Curated annotation (Swiss-Prot):
Biological role stated in the UniProt entry: Responsible for the cleavages located at the N-terminus of the replicase polyprotein. Participates together with nsp4 in the assembly of virally-induced cytoplasmic double-membrane vesicles necessary for viral replication. Antagonizes innate immune induction of type I interferon by blocking the phosphorylation, dimerization and subsequent nuclear translocation of host IRF3. Also prevents host NF-kappa-B signaling. In addition, PL-PRO possesses a deubiquitinating/deISGylating activity and processes both 'Lys-48'- and 'Lys-63'-linked polyubiquitin chains from cellular substrates.
Protein name in UniProt: Papain-like protease nsp3
Record domain Macro: where: 1-168
Domain of life according to the entry: Viruses
Gene for this chain: rep
Complexes and interactors: May form homohexamers. Interacts with N protein.
Regulation: Inhibited in vitro by GRL-0617.
Catalytic activity: Thiol-dependent hydrolysis of ester, thioester, amide, peptide and isopeptide bonds formed by the C-terminal Gly of ubiquitin (a 76-residue protein attached to proteins as an intracellular targeting signal)
Subcellular location as annotated: Host endoplasmic reticulum membrane
Record's bilayer topology term: Multi-pass membrane protein
């Protein structure tokens, strides 16, 4: 149904809300939810752990089966697997982990995976355990994504700083 409500429109195609991405997935019933994936699709932490727990581990079971046959993703890459109970599809997208020395330039590649989907529910890529500056990640999103992206930021403080920064 893609029933997004209460988003702030930043550009013609990028929207943002102070919300929990799992609660958004349940309310919105999106065609695609984006996962903040790692190359091995091990969803023990971060946004990935929240999405996987909300699927009662079905996302991890499917991901383990996928990797054993198909091999790992690349940093800046993506795969499309089931959305389970959250969405029709899950776009697993690997942003660079700058906490572990990966090149922040790969964030552009990472957001280019969104352009194969008309409308997405997504977290801010490379945030949290991935260690990137969130203000920078929002700029790369706005500059790179051409399809409609609905960004869920749960931390109110961070949401307020992102919005303030974007409106400067
Ligand atoms: O046709 C669509 O875009 C579409 C279809 C199903 C869903 C869907 C939503 C929640 C759980 C499973 C699937 N979302 C979007």
């Amino acid at each position: 149904v893609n029933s997004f409500s209460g988003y702030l429109k930043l550009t013609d195609n990028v929207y943002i809300k102070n919300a929990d991405i799992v609660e958004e997935a349940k309310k919105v019933k999106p065609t695609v939810v984006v996962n903040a994936a790692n190359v091995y699709l091990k969803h023990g932490g971060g946004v990935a752990g929240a999405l996987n727990k909300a699927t009662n581990n079905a996302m991890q079971v499917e991901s383990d089966d996928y990797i054993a046959t198909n091999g790992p993703l690349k940093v800046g890459g993506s795969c499309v697997l089931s959305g389970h109970n959250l969405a029709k599809h899950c776009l697993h997208v690997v942003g660079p982990n700058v906490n572990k020395g990966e090149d922040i330039q790969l964030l552009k590649s990472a957001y280019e995976n969104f352009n194969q989907h008309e409308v997405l529910l997504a977290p801010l890529l490379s945030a949290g355990i991935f260690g990137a500056d969130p203000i920078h990640s929002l700029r790369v999103c706005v500059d790179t994504v051409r399809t409609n992206v609905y960004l869920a930021v749960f931390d109110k403080n961070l949401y307020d700083k992102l919005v303030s920064s974007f409106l400067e």
